[PDB]
A paper describes a structure:
Crystals of free MHV-S HE and of a complex of HE0 with αNeu4,5Ac22Me diffracted to 2.1 and 2.5 Å resolution, respectively. The structure of the R domain, however, was resolved, and in the complex the ligand molecule is well-defined. While the overall organization of the MHV-S RBS is similar to that of BCoV-Mebus HE, the orientation of the receptor analogue with respect to the RBS is strikingly different. As compared to the ligand in the BCoV-Mebus HE binding site, the αNeu4,5Ac22Me receptor analogue is rotated by about 90° and shifted by about 2.5 Å. Two hydrogen bonds are formed between the nitrogen and oxygen main-chain atoms of Lys217 and the oxygen of the C4 acetyl group and the nitrogen of the 5-N-acetyl group, respectively. The Ser220 main chain nitrogen accepts an additional, weak hydrogen bond from the C8 hydroxyl group of the ligand. Most remarkably, the hydrophobic pocket that in BCoV-Mebus HE accommodates the 9-O-acetyl moiety of the receptor (comprised of Leu161, Tyr184 Leu266 and Leu267) -arguably the most crucial element of the BCoV HE RBS- is conserved in MHV-S HE (comprised of Ile166, Tyr189, Tyr281, and Leu282), but it now accepts the Sia 5-N-acetyl group, while the Sia glycerol side-chain is solvent exposed. Moreover, the hydrophobic patch in the BCoV-Mebus HE RBS that interacts with the Sia 5-N-acetyl group apparently changed into a shallow pocket that accommodates the Sia 4-O-acetyl moiety. As the Sia-4-O-acetyl group is crucial for ligand recognition by MHV-S HE, this pocket must be key to receptor-binding. In accordance, single Ala substitutions of Leu119, Ile166, Phe212, Leu260, or Tyr281 all reduced receptor-binding activity (although that of Ile166 to lesser extent) as shown by hemagglutination assay and solid-phase lectin binding assay.
Numbering used by the authors:
A (entry chain A): 25 to 50, 58 to 108, 114 to 306, 315 to 334, 348 to 410
B (entry chain B): 25 to 44, 66 to 305, 314 to 332, 351 to 405
The structure:
């Protein structure tokens, strides 16, 4: 009785679901209408063909926003690389590290949204879309061109940006990891070591990242691509300091607001980078099966009593399993006493109790 | 029935206590030295070789680095900087000991190219700091506007806690310098394998005179993976770790338990990685197992209770409406 169920769910109505499916509600005989009731729900933010990761890094932005105590993620659907001879594995790594940070922090905050980050840069040089391919163009982090008067990429360069209005922000700190090239006119042995740092101007804390690999962007030596760390930053005034190659800084941040009592996120799939990202204590991964977004919605109509490592317990009283990492009102697997002294209602002259 | 008890305890024999009843001294599950603490051993010469391993880890110490004794690096320094250091330190140890079985100390060595050596720059009349080590300038430099560096390797543990510190203020080199001459301390650690850099610049303008007091050492506490590291100093005295907290043997997340002049440990001890317990009858909980350890306290029995355990660990009772299964029962009979 009350076996744990392998599904994402909620304890009450205070939940929110981020998705990459079609969220909208797309008849005298009402059983022909196949929209689930939660279609168009204000507890769902979802766009077919997009995702938090895509909107965080690329031009085809969708304005994901949501607030809830129990946050749920539906993750679903060659691969992206910055350069013709890049490496998509770096992007699989970026994705795992992004969602690790998003999943972890959404166990601590009610509210997620995106904000645009502006910068102040003292030079004349402008942004350049250095990282792209045939279907997608990267715009976060922004990359700033060489000043016309510098003859090569061996220069220092900085810009200011401010983060305001949220408790914490998730931003990308990235470098091209390998032998970066300034131009194809250059010699083969002339390469650069991308180096980037963010500096809190008030606290004096520096987050830095130096390129360390030897890969490049040719058929003989391929692999050069963007490696990103995802930083959770407090609000304040920051300076992006580049010691070599192109200055990069954030153009978009995930805004985190409204702290809650720690409540693990729940994640479900239709790569396994979301699986790698979803770890205890901050995330419960569910490998649910019949898995369409439309089936998820129907499965989110009713509450459950307890959400735990093994799954969802519908009922709050007893189970054959002991809940581990339980949240909510969790059942016991103790077997219940047959009798106690309250039970008998008369003293027997000849039998003991 | 089965109200939660405001005590520290264990779910089984797999527990350990760090600190400063006779029965438990023989248990082989205590590491404690009167007059000392983890923080104190981390930073100072008065070192105790704390060491212990367990699934449920308990801490009962911190008092032996108070504000009433009150340490500062300089005559006109600031103990509150050291209070803040304490909070950050214990925040990191508590969070990490929810994830690892074993805690211990290791000594960290370095390679440095110059002839200059350690200087005990931070000390009061009854305590000398040796972690981080500070390396004095080369005799050939007349000012302190230089770049100094040393290598150090971290080996033998899954993670290491080390201090990254700067003097935060208008740091002085010698009294012979004019008042207007001063330094802005800058320290960083660089992982040569990964390319990740952690840096820290002084941002305050306070000093070490009666007229402008407050210059002391501010430390961040980094959890680093094993590898080859480089301490890079861009100004003032080079500093790098001499001791590290050695974290070993990963475990399924199990919150630490903490019991008690200051409340830095209370700030350090936060859900979900730590359970703080107020006020011995609290330490008596180590004599026996309990079924469930939760935010409200320890639940002795694993079946029923009047409270719903929150952040429960073990075999946790329900607070549903349940009675006894015998047909003879009426009051409380399911
Ligand atoms: C959840 O689990 C708990 C813990 O296991 C369980 O509580 C136990 O229930 C069992 C079975 O009912 C109790 O055992 C019975 O005790 C009968 C005597 O009852 C009196 O004495 C009890 C012993 O008291 C001493 O020890 C306890 C600590 O152990 C200590 O607190 C006391 O101070 C004292 O030193 C006493 O606990 C008990 O008190 C309970 O019941 C009264 C009366 O209703 C109530 O007022 C109290 O609030 C409290 O709930 C009472 O004072 C004894 O006659 C009986 O023996 C018969 O049956 C057994 C088999 O069942 C035969 O072996 C025997 O031959 C007899 O036929 C039996 O031993 C046990 O004492 C409980 N323990 C505790 C700590 O409460 C709950 O029932 C479980 N609940 C559910 C829903 O499953
Ligand atoms: C992380 O990356 C940056 C960029 O590579 C490093 O900064 C650069 O370090 C190199 C090598 O030490 C320096 O090159 C030197 O240039 C000077 C001229 O000033 C010359 O005398 C040397 O022979 C050498 O060619 C370069 O100056 C320096 N650039 C800047 C802007 O500081 C940085 O050191 C790396 N971080 C770590 C921790 O290694
Ligand atoms: C834990 O909670 C659940 C749900 O509240 C309890 O299960 C429910 O138990 C009731 C009472 O026993 C069941 O109703 C009865 O069912 C029997 C047999 O079918 C019937 O003869 C009675 O006339 C009455 O309808 C109910 O079906 C059942 N619900 C479910 C979903 O299974 C359970 O008993 C609780 N367990 C304990 C130990 O408290
Ligand atoms: C954090 O602290 C370090 C150490 O103070 C900063 O590096 C230092 O920055 C100062 C201020 O820009 C540099 O001063 C310059 O000195 C040169 C000659 O030495 C002079 O030609 C310039 O006009 C200027 O006065 C200093 O060189 C530099 N030190 C080193 C070793 O690189 C660092 O910039 C701070 N970090 C951030 C992110 O602000
Ligand atoms: C980025 O931020 C700098 C402030 O630290 C600023 O540099 C200064 O110019 C401001 C403007 O009045 C001065 O108040 C200040 O003295 C300067 N810097 C320092 C450290 O004191 C830069 O100008 C800003 N960059 C851009 C492009 O606006
Ligand atoms: C899931 O639980 C929530 C919170 O308990 C339910 O909200 C309750 O709604 C019913 C009427 O529909 C009321 O009896 C309660 O007072 C409501 N709670 C609050 C806090 O106002 C919600 O109904 C449940 N969802 C489902 C599908 O049963
Ligand atoms: C707490 O529980 C532990 C483990 O369940 C108990 O350790 C057991 O003790 C018995 C009796 O000495 C041994 O026969 C078992 O083999 C022990 N198991 C282990 C894993 O060590 C311990 O006795 C309990 N403590 C108390 C006070 O009851
Ligand atoms: C201080 O404690 C440490 C850690 O427990 C001791 O170092 C360990 O010693 C054992 C052998 O007893 C070795 O197998 C381990 O490799 C050591 N651990 C580490 C991290 O190096 C050390 O011996 C103790 N020092 C003294 C003087 O007793
Ligand atoms: C062929 O693609 C590359 C190259 O490897 O040469 C990628 C190269 O980008 C990197 C990170 O090496 C790019 N360099 C700059 C500074 O824009 C570089 C220049 O845009 C190109 O040389 C001029 O066109 O283009
Ligand atoms: C004891 O007071 C001070 C001072 O305020 O000047 C503290 C000063 O230390 C710091 C961190 O300011 C110390 N300087 C050095 C480089 O060791 C400095 C030298 O020991 C001393 O001035 C050398 O003569 O002494
Ligand atoms: C996008 O969402 C943000 C945060 O929820 C909101 O403030 C803003 O109205 C939205 N922007 C647009 C263009 O709709
Ligand atoms: C950021 O920019 C995009 C497109 O320029 C816009 O639609 C979005 O609403 C902006 N976010 C905010 C918080 O204004
Ligand atoms: C580190 O050094 C201290 C003081 O000399 C010593 O007592 C301790 O045993 C050393 N630790 C290790 C792991 O060698
Ligand atoms: C530190 O390591 C670097 C790289 O391995 C090496 O070039 C240098 O000689 C080392 N410095 C010292 C002082 O040993
Ligand atoms: K750069
Ligand atoms: K320094």
């Amino acid at each position: 009785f009350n076996e744990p169920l392998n599904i994402v769910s909620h304890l009450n109505d205070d939940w929110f679901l981020f998705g990459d499916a079609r969220s909208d509600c797309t008849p005298k005989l009402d059983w022909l209408d196949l929209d689930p009731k939660l279609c168009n729900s204000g507890r769902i933010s979802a766009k077919s063909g997009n995702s938090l990761f895509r909107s965080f890094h690329f031009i085809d932005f969708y304005n994901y926003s949501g607030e809830g105590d129990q946050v749920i993620f539906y993750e679903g659907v060659h691969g992206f690389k910055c350069l013709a001879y890049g490496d998509n594995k770096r992007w699989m790594g970026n994705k795992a590290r992004f969602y690790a940070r998003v999943y972890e922090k959404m166990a601590q905050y009610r509210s997620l949204s995106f904000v645009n980050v502006s910068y102040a840069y003292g030079g004349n040089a402008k942004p350049t879309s250095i990282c792209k391919d045939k279907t997608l163009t990267l715009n976060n982090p922004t990359f700033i061109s060489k000043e016309s008067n510098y003859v090569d990429y061996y220069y220092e360069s900085e810009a200011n940006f401010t983060l305001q209005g949220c408790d914490e922000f998730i931003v990308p700190l990235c470098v091209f990891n390998g032998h970066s090239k300034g131009s194809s006119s250059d010699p083969a042995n002339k390469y650069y070591t991308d180096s980037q740092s963010y500096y809190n101007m008030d606290t004096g804390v520096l987050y830095g990242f130096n390129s360390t690999l030897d890969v490049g962007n040719t058929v003989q030596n391929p692999g050069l691509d963007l490696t990103c760390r995802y930083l959770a930053l407090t609000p304040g005034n920051y300076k992006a300091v580049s010691l070599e190659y192109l200055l990069s800084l954030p153009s978009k941040a995930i805004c985190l607001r409204k702290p809650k009592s720690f409540m693990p996120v729940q994640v479900v799939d239709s790569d396994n980078m979301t699986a790698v990202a979803c770890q205890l204590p901050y995330c419960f991964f569910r490998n649910t099966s019949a898995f369409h977004f439309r089936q998820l919605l129907s499965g989110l109509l009713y509450n459950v009593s307890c959400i735990a490592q093994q799954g969802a317990f519908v009922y709050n009283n007893v189970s054959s399993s002991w809940p581990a990492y339980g949240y909510g009102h969790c059942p016991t697997a103790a077997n219940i006493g047959y009798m106690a002294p309250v039970c008998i209602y008369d003293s027997d002259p000849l039998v003991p109790r």
